[PDB]
Amino acid sequence: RFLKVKNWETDVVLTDTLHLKSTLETGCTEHICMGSIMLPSVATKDQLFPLAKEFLDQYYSSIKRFGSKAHMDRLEEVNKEIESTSTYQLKDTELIYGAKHAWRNASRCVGRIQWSKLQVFDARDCTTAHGMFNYICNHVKYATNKGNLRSAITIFPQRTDGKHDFRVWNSQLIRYAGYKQPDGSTLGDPANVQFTEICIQQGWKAPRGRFDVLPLLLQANGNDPELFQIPPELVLEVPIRHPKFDWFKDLGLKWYGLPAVSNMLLEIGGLEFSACPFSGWYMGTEIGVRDYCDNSRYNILEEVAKKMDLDMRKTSSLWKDQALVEINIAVLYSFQSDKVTIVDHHSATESFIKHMENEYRCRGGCPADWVWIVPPMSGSITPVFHQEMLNYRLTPSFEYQPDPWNTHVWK
Amino acid sequence: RFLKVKNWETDVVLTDTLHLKSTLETGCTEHICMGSIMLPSVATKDQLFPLAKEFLDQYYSSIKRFGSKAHMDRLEEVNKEIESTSTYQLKDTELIYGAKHAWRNASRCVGRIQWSKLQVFDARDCTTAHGMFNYICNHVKYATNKGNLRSAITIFPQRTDGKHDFRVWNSQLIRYAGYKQPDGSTLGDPANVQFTEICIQQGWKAPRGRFDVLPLLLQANGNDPELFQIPPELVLEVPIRHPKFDWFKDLGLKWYGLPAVSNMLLEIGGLEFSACPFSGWYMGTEIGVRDYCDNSRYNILEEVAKKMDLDMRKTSSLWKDQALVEINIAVLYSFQSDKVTIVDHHSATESFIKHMENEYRCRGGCPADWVWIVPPMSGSITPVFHQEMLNYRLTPSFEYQPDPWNTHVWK
Numbered sequence: 090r091f092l093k094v095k096n097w098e099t100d101v102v103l104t105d106t107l108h109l110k111s112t113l114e115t116g117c118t119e120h121i122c123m124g125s126i127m128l129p130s131v132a133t134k135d136q137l138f139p140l141a142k143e144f145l146d147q148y149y150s151s152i153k154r155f156g157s158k159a160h161m162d163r164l165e166e167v168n169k170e171i172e173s174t175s176t177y178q179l180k181d182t183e184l185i186y187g188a189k190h191a192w193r194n195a196s197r198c199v200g201r202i203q204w205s206k207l208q209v210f211d212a213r214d215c216t217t218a219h220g221m222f223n224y225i226c227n228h229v230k231y232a233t234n235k236g237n238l239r240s241a242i243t244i245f246p247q248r249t250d251g252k253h254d255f256r257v258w259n260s261q262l263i264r265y266a267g268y269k270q271p272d273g274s275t276l277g278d279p280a281n282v283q284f285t286e287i288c289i290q291q292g293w294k295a296p297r298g299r300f301d302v303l304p305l306l307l308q309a310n311g312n313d314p315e316l317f318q319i320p321p322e323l324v325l326e327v328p329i330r331h332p333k334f335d336w337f338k339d340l341g342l343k344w345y346g347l348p349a350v351s352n353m354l355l356e357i358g359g360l361e362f363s364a365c366p367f368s369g370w371y372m373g374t375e376i377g378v379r380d381y382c383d384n385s386r387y388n389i390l391e392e393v394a395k396k397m398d399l400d401m402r403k404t405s406s407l408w409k410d411q412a413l414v415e416i417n418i419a420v421l422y423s424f425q426s427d428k429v430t431i432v433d434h435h436s437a438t439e440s441f442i443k444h445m446e447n448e449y450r451c452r453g454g455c456p457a458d459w460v461w462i463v464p465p466m467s468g469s470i471t472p473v474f475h476q477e478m479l480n481y482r483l484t485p486s487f488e489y490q491p492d493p494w495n496t497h498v499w500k
Numbered sequence: 501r502f503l504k505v506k507n508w509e510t511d512v513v514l515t516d517t518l519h520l521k522s523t524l525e526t527g528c529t530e531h532i533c534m535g536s537i538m539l540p541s542v543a544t545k546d547q548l549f550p551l552a553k554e555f556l557d558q559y560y561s562s563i564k565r566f567g568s569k570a571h572m573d574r575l576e577e578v579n580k581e582i583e584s585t586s587t588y589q590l591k592d593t594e595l596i597y598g599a600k601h602a603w604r605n606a607s608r609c610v611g612r613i614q615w616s617k618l619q620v621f622d623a624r625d626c627t628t629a630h631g632m633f634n635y636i637c638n639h640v641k642y643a644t645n646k647g648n649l650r651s652a653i654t655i656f657p658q659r660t661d662g663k664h665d666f667r668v669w670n671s672q673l674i675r676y677a678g679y680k681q682p683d684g685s686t687l688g689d690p691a692n693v694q695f696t697e698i699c700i701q702q703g704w705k706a707p708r709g710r711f712d713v714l715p716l717l718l719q720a721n722g723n724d725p726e727l728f729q730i731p732p733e734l735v736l737e738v739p740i741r742h743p744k745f746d747w748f749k750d751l752g753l754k755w756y757g758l759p760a761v762s763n764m765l766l767e768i769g770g771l772e773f774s775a776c777p778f779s780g781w782y783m784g785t786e787i788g789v790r791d792y793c794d795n796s797r798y799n800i801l802e803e804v805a806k807k808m809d810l811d812m813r814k815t816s817s818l819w820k821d822q823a824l825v826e827i828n829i830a831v832l833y834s835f836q837s838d839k840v841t842i843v844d845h846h847s848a849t850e851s852f853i854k855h856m857e858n859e860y861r862c863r864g865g866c867p868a869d870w871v872w873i874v875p876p877m878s879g880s881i882t883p884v885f886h887q888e889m890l891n892y893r894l895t896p897s898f899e900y901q902p903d904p905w906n907t908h909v910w911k
């Protein structure tokens with residue numbers, strides 16, 4: 090009831106009692122562990138008040154005014170509005186608290202040491218896709234800050250009935266296009282090949298190349314989504330060069346500075362925000378390892394090995410490993426030489442251990458998903474490999490949600 | 501009740517029903533996942549027959565003689581012996597089946613594609629530590645096979661009362677010594693520093709160097725353990741050289757060929773074999789990544805980076821990553837040039853996916869621990885990173901057990 094997690098590199102032990110507050114289910118049972126399953130899995134007025142109460146109790150118990158008169162009135166105020174409207178609206182302060190704690194509770198995120206430095210943009214007055222585009226453009230501009238990246242989230246109106254949903258259809262605000270070829274292979278990013286074709290379906294004019302920034306597909310109040318192009322001056326890009334290999338420029342790779350997830354659902358006090366694009370800065374491995382070297386992504390281990398003069402005949406020459414380190418030295422070096430914020434997986438994972446210690450002390454725990462926290466290269470030379478982690482589901486939270494083109498009732 | 505695991509690199513799906521046969525508990529609950537906890541946690545005659553029955557049912561249902569007369573007599577035969585003796589003895593065939601399936605069920609093992617090619621040595625007639633040494637020496641000789649390594653296990657008498665236990669006190673049959681210094685630092689292997697001092701306590705004469713093979717500490721029928729030196733001609737060693745860097749020989753590293761775990765417990769039909777040393781061959785990363793580059797092991801990233809001419813000032817130069825690839829190219833290259841069996845993490849993890857497909861088809865599943873299957877470097881460029889895995893506990897099994905010096909009643 091007071092579980093211990095050990096670090097086996099430092100012998101440091103920490104005690105978790107935060108997991109007691111946990112509410113949702115993980116997927117695992119007493120007899121099966123599902124910690125390597127990727128995506129394991131309308132609202133009525135009865136369900137809503139315990140969720141509002143639970144949330145309001147921790148918000149006021151965090152501004153040191155637990156259960157006071159100011160609390161109990163807000164508790165009464167929300168109850169009455171859930172009676173009247175069968176839903177309710179968050180105060181601006183409650184929205185900012187909820188958002189920051191959805192990120193704080195995100196067990197799959199290695200960057201949460203920054204969770205309280207989050208800029209919250211309140212777009213709950215938005216009504217059209219054009220307003221969404223406008224809000225999103227101001228988000229991109231603000232978070233990018235000329236390469237001195239700043240963390241941010243923009244929150245569109247909450248789900249009401251279910252058939253009037255705000256959705257950003259892109260999985261990220263800035264992604265490169267993916268075109269399959271007549272000869273079967275793929276130009277650009279294979280991940281987005283279906284999304285690239287949805288944009289052409291609704292009317293996009295593709296400049297069929299490699300790193301073509303996709304347009305936004307924005308759905309407002311359930312209406313069919315509409316295409317908008319981010320002004321290119323707002324899409325900051327880093328050309329990737331190596332600090333040794335001058336042929337590396339000829340590879341002709343580049344990446345966008347701003348990681349901005351737009352397909353997830355923010356849950357606050359039982360309210361569901363179906364469009365809540367949120368952005369930080371990249372850990373280098375996300376680009377250099379997964380984006381560039383995943384077999385079903387850009388898949389560049391082939392060509393980088395070639396130009397490095399590598400023994401590619403044998404599996405056990407580790408040519409794949411060797412070209413992979415060089416690629417991530419190049420991503421890092423390019424971002425820093427351009428004053429574009431980026432963190433290496435050693436600095437990020439050390440910061441997360443430091444974050445874990447802060448959380449266990451002044452919070453009694455830190456939900457953490459080892460499968461996702463450990464970086465996708467050099468796992469055991471980073472301190473998170475050696476750190477036991479309890480995973481559990483706290484609210485407020487970011488949740489996955491179906492792709493909107495499978496669920497929308499089109500017209 | 502018929503769960504699906506997906507591979508996200510190939511989109512291949514497999515259905516698990518083997519997990520239904522699972523019996524033991526994992527540590528996880530509906531509300532907490534413990535898949536990154538390292539070690540999560542006398543026998544009476546009532547408990548013993550269901551365990552014997554369960555085991556005998558699957559043994560006969562595997563030689564295509566489920567529930568026949570030959571089965572039901574053995575079922576009756578064991579019941580009567582559990583009445584008579586409050587325990588029982590396995591047939592030689594049952595011992596070999598049980599052992600091979602303990603390995604087959606070992607969810608943390610990436611090498612299980614070889615599980616049916618296991619050589620079982622029956623040491624249940626052993627009575628003294630000298631007999632144990634003799635059995636163990638024949639095990640080392642057989643499994644090493646002049647570098648053409650062969651998988652093997654030696655099974656000493658089963659636990660009876662609890663105070664008459666056979667134990668190998670070494671955690672592995674062949675390990676290097678670890679000496680702390682007066683100036684605090686460590687020569688040899690820091691993992692074994694306490695065990696190195698237990699040997700000196702019982703009378704070992706340490707040649708205080710680096711790669712000093714430790715002696716065996718063998719406990720027989722609960723008696724205090726005794727020291728024995730493996731004849732050095734039976735300890736095959738690989739000197740580690742690089743196929744580019746001739747200064748790499750000057751590093752003066754070497755490793756033993758034979759990975760042989762000796763501190764675990766083999767459970768078969770509810771019988772407990774407290775001494776069951778088992779050996780295979782190395783995956784290169786176990787040496788080059790964990791043994792050599794763990795901070796609290798040999799910790800050689802420091803010196804390899806130096807001689808490579810590396811930017812060691814900054815964290816984000818990835819000097820640690822770069823020296824790590826070279827070290828594992830050297831481990832691999834040395835073992836193969838000496839005709840000593842070794843597998844690279846690309847070949848081993850591809851073989852394990854292939855193994856998983858075989859298991860899901862002709863067995864309905866494969867218990868697998870992602871946290872341990874994914875190699876400790878280059879995780880996502882190997883196919884196991886992208887493969888969902890269900891972890892569950894099947895029997896027969898290898899289980900962890902306390903170190904014998906914490907539990908023994910000495911005299």
Ligand code: HEM
Pocket residue numbers: 192195197198199200201203207240241242367368369370371372375432437461487
């Ligand atoms: C500030 C810099 C940040 C860094 C360095 C960082 C790092 C990461 C990384 C490496 C992942 C794994 C993503 C993947 O492998 O696909 C991740 C996941 C995640 N991050 Fe963070 N992150 C940052 C900011 C944020 C912010 C500002 C939020 C929310 C407001 C956030 C919420 C999440 C969530 C919900 C996930 C899970 C995504 C999923 O499950 O698909 N992160 N983060």
Ligand code: HEM
Pocket residue numbers: 603606608609610611612614618651652653778779780781782783786843848872898
């Ligand atoms: C044949 C070549 C083999 C290879 C390449 C191999 C590979 C591995 C690796 C890399 C690990 C993780 C160990 C670690 O990181 O400390 C492991 C664990 C394990 N292996 Fe295998 N193995 C082999 C043979 C065997 C055999 C013959 C058995 C049993 C008869 C076995 C049973 C186990 C067990 C029980 C574990 C878990 C150890 C623990 O939890 O501490 N392995 N194996």
Ligand SMILES: C[C@H](O)[C@H](O)[C@H]1CNc2nc(N)[nH]c(=O)c2N1
Pocket residue numbers: 124125126127460461462508885886887888889
């Ligand atoms: C099968 C496995 O769950 C899947 O590949 C996960 C593994 N861990 C991950 N970790 C991170 N950070 N990102 C990912 O996409 C994944 N993918």
Ligand SMILES: C[C@H](O)[C@H](O)[C@H]1CNc2nc(N)[nH]c(=O)c2N1
Pocket residue numbers: 097474475476477478535536537538871872873
């Ligand atoms: C904290 C974590 O459970 C621990 O470091 C594990 C991680 N995965 C591992 N995987 C393997 N193969 N071997 C290990 O020793 C470990 N250690």
Ligand SMILES: Cc1cc(N)nc(CCCN2CC(F)(F)C2)c1
Pocket residue numbers: 260348349350367368369370371372375
């Ligand atoms: C805010 C943020 C920062 C960062 N550094 N990284 C991410 C994750 C990028 C997208 N990930 C693919 C997925 F959908 F699984 C989530 C998000």
Ligand SMILES: Cc1cc(N)nc(CCCN2CC(F)(F)C2)c1
Pocket residue numbers: 671759760761778779780781782783786
């Ligand atoms: C048979 C075998 C083969 C192999 N290739 N590797 C191992 C594991 C070596 C020891 N491991 C450290 C631990 F105790 F955790 C288990 C065992």
Ligand SMILES: [Zn+2]
Pocket residue numbers: 117121122123124528532533534535
């Ligand atoms: Zn679990």
